[PDB]
Amino acid sequence: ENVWFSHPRRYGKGSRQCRVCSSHTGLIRKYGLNICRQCFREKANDIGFNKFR
Amino acid sequence: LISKKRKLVADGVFYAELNEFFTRELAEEGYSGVEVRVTPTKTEVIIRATRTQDVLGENGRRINELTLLVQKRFKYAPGTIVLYAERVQDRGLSAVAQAESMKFKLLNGLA
Amino acid sequence: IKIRITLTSTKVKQLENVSSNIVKNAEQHNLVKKGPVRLPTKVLKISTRKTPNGEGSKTWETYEMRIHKRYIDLEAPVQIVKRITQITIEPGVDVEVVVA
Amino acid sequence: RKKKVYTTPKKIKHKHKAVKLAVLSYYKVDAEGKVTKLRRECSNPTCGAGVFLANHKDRLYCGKCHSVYKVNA
Amino acid sequence: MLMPKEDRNKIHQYLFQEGVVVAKKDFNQAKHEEIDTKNLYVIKALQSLTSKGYVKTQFSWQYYYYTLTEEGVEYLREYLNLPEHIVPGTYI
RNA sequence: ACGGAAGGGCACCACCAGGAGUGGAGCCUGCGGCUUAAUUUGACUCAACACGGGGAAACUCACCAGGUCCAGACACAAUAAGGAUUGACAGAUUGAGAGCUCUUUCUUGAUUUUGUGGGUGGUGGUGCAUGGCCGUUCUUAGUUGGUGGAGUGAUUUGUCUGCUUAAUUGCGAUAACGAACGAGACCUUAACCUACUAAAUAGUGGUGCUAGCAUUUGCUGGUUAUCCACUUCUUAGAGGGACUAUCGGUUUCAAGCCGAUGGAAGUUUGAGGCAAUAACAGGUCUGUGAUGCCCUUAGACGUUCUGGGCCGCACGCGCGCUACACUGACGGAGCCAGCGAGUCUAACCUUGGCCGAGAGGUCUUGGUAAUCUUGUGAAACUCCGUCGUGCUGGGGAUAGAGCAUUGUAAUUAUUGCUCUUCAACGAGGAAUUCCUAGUAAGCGCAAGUCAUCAGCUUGCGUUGAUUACGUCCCUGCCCUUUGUACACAC
Ligand SMILES: [Mg+2]
Ligand SMILES: [Mg+2]
Ligand SMILES: [Mg+2]
Ligand SMILES: [Mg+2]
Ligand SMILES: [Mg+2]
Ligand SMILES: [Mg+2]
Ligand SMILES: [Mg+2]
Ligand SMILES: [Mg+2]
Ligand SMILES: [Mg+2]
Ligand SMILES: [Mg+2]
Ligand SMILES: [Mg+2]
Ligand SMILES: [Mg+2]
Ligand SMILES: [Mg+2]
Ligand SMILES: [Mg+2]
Ligand SMILES: [Mg+2]
Ligand SMILES: [Mg+2]
Ligand SMILES: [Mg+2]
Ligand SMILES: [Mg+2]
Ligand SMILES: [Mg+2]
Ligand SMILES: [Mg+2]
Ligand SMILES: [Mg+2]
Ligand SMILES: [Mg+2]
Ligand SMILES: [Mg+2]
Ligand SMILES: [Mg+2]
Ligand SMILES: [Mg+2]
Ligand SMILES: [Mg+2]
Ligand SMILES: [Mg+2]
Ligand SMILES: [Mg+2]
Ligand SMILES: [Zn+2]
Ligand SMILES: [Zn+2]
């Protein structure tokens, strides 16, 4: 039916999800990358973020 | 028309995504990394693998379908994205190639 | 003609050799220029918890990405401008030219 | 996961299957004559005089303008 | 899954023309790009194609990259009733 | 391994001398218990309890009361174009213009439907079956081969009596020699550069034009196409600089240590990042399209929709925030930061003008950003006043009424604003936390989560003390010797 999945998802945690793992909790929305924090910890080196201090 | 911060993290996640994609399907070709060079008139993706004949296929059919796949996914114009293959040197000095060879040996059933 | 070249990379020596070969080509063509003005390096910081779960010691981790930006202003005709943008293509360094 | 007793009414009530009739497409039958049409069809330029209007009560129901074309002749 | 033959032939002719197809793993999207069909339709039709050895997949960040085999291209050729060696997605 | 055994050396997650506290009150938030249809769940000494980046209206969401749908691939069998099957107006029905189902007939036409096998999905279980990651043992200095030597052997020496170091760091000693990992070295950052390169996206000075006062030159300002000049301040890039330098003491007189001078810097200059071996049957299957096995798989534990719940309150604990007042509250003025973030096929940070007590609204404007928001004109602070030791003009919980904003939706008030209400609290018992310099403490600001919601966290700067410069008494840690009836090891 059209009513199925009718509810708006224009904001809140249901509007976003991890671009890697489709998780809703722990999103990093900074700089518009939209990765969960664990997947960011894995992929940060090849994204270009490094630890200096 | 994007800020420089978001542009640089965009190419970062783009490199990471295509590297994950290439290490997912090109495992049996010794895929040992990828490099990108954006350039006026074209962006080029240099894959560094061992079995270049296997990542190419017959007359570059696999390179063609890979170019088409990344173009369809990243909404590039046809021709503005190009892929090259490269027989990487020093295969022993590459952790991912040795790791995938170990994986394939253990899947074949070696001790 | 009043063109501006901006380099917006993260690799500092790549950006530096790009700018140096740009300026030596410019002074080889004896072009007037405001030299390479180096903007403040902007540090993109992301602070997270190290753990995937919740337990342990509350250990935090700051992943940073430094972004280095330079700009050079040139007054030079369209043909030397066209060979300038034909040349100086460095891997990992993003450049863009604006006119007027 | 203990159990589900189904406190709802035991109402497994799945619908029809577009109920299997006999042969259909009843326009008319005319002995050595031309056959007219039952179910005077819809008035859309989209329907090419092939789709019946239904007639339950108080209205006629369509197939091309598939739900709303209500005429009381 | 039930889907009109119009959209089935849309999916199949696009696949035979291009050779690859991406499908962002987003059900209820109701509008694929590169194809005017539902994303669920193209995804499930391609899955039914993959199960009979014609085409292979990769998930890879919720994106469903599909590329077809030689059994796939000949099956699609005889399905669309095209001449032998008409055109694959494998030009030189 | 342990010792209420010894020796030596260490640590504000130990103490000493103190500082600010917590524990006491109100409130915020987390946990237990109780209650409930559900109050989803993990974690329980350090090493659970403002933790799951967990600030939950819906979504999140996994729980509860109900309603749909199938996204059950594929193969085989059955029905079957005289039709497999799909959909649907209106009415009943239902929270519900969900045909969900029913009435009535229409619509579509091989995609299907039924059965079998077989899949697929699961924030379902197992963190005691696992991978990965993280934490901890453990911020201490420790760990390991090779060839020799000792021992039947497990094993030991090397890896050590002394002295030194923050450090198995070194001087040395020596059945050991030569090595490796760790430490250190390294990298980032904070300090210095009137030395180099520069720069209307940072400034400064002069020149023009112009405002005010003095006029006698001047002082304070403004000025984008007024140019000229420079880089001290600002930004960077390349370098330099400190190595404990010099001197004086002290030490077998060696490693080193102490004091002074010079110096921007003389606690490995400060702060971090990285960080060995071996392990915990630590945590996590609720981050993962990482996963084995088990369970479920179509009136499903899948998924989605409506509405609740995660907030529920006799009580007990843990992080905190406000305070208990004149070193003060309030009202006027004065008036100074740094880290950062920001809109494209979107609607972000907003200047300025106007309206409004206010919150806020409206018309425009700048900015994809050293340029604009923003000199973020922050708060504490300072100076004048009012108050006056009175639970008082402290304090601002608990309430009532109204006005706004976000959102589909605010009712168990989302928050903000206005008025009124004006409670405990009179400095906190046993206990107990953190801390040695721009550190503690006070003070606010930015970012994260974010449609809206900080009393939270991560950083930043602002004001800036007291008291040690030690010890092993408590709590523990490292090494050696010693005793052991311990080995899941007091
Ligand atoms: Mg001490
Ligand atoms: Mg004390
Ligand atoms: Mg207090
Ligand atoms: Mg500890
Ligand atoms: Mg719900
Ligand atoms: Mg909810
Ligand atoms: Mg579920
Ligand atoms: Mg375990
Ligand atoms: Mg584990
Ligand atoms: Mg031996
Ligand atoms: Mg022997
Ligand atoms: Mg030996
Ligand atoms: Mg002037
Ligand atoms: Mg001396
Ligand atoms: Mg250090
Ligand atoms: Mg896991
Ligand atoms: Mg809760
Ligand atoms: Mg805590
Ligand atoms: Mg005041
Ligand atoms: Mg400032
Ligand atoms: Mg008051
Ligand atoms: Mg203690
Ligand atoms: Mg915030
Ligand atoms: Mg909330
Ligand atoms: Mg929080
Ligand atoms: Mg004894
Ligand atoms: Mg025993
Ligand atoms: Mg005992
Ligand atoms: Zn993720
Ligand atoms: Zn019609």
Instruction: Please count the other Cβ atoms lying within 10 Å of the Cβ belonging to residue E2.
Output: 4
List bases in chain F with any atom under 7 Å of a protein Cβ.
42-43, 47-49, 51-54, 58-61, 65-75, 82-90, 96, 98-113, 123-124, 132-136, 187-189, 197-201, 225, 235-238, 271-274, 282-285, 287-290, 295, 299-301, 304-306, 339-344, 368-370, 407-408, 447-452, 457-459
Domains of chain B: 4-84 (3.30.300.20)
CA distance B70 to A19: 16
User: What resolution (Å)?
Assistant: 2.8
What does the domain layout of chain E look like in residue ranges? 1-92
* Structural tokens at position A45: 């080196």
Burial-class residue E29 by CB neighbours within 10 Å (0-12, 13-18, 19+).
Answer: middle
Nearest CA among B59, B58, B56, B39 for reference residue B47: B56
Q: List the single best residue of C39, C65, C84 to mutate versus B (max B Cβ within 10 A).
A: C65
Nucleotide nearest to A40 (CA to C1'): F287
Which helix (H) or strand (E) segment holds residue B51: the answer is none
Give the 3-state secondary structure of residue E92.
coil
Nearest CA among B77, B64, B62 for reference residue B26: B62
What is the helix, strand, coil percentage profile of chain D, to 5?
0, 5, 95
Phi, psi dihedrals of residue D62, rounded to the nearest 5°: -105, 175
Nearest CA among E34, E17, E20 for reference residue E64: E20
Structural biology method used = cryo-EM
The per-residue b/e assignment along D34-64, b for 16 or more CB within 10 angstroms, e otherwise, is eeeeeeebbeeeebeeebbbeeeeeebbbbb
Helices (H), C12-77: 12-28
How many Å separate Cα A30 from the centre of its chain?
Answer: 10
Give residues 8-47 of chain A lying near strand F (Cβ < 7 A).
8-16, 18, 21-32, 36-39, 41-42
How many Å separate Cα E28 from the centre of its chain?
Answer: 19
Q: Are strands E20-22 and C60-75 parallel, antiparallel or unpaired?
A: unpaired
Type of residue found at C49:
R
What does the domain layout of chain C look like in residue ranges? 1-100
CA distance B84 to B35: 10
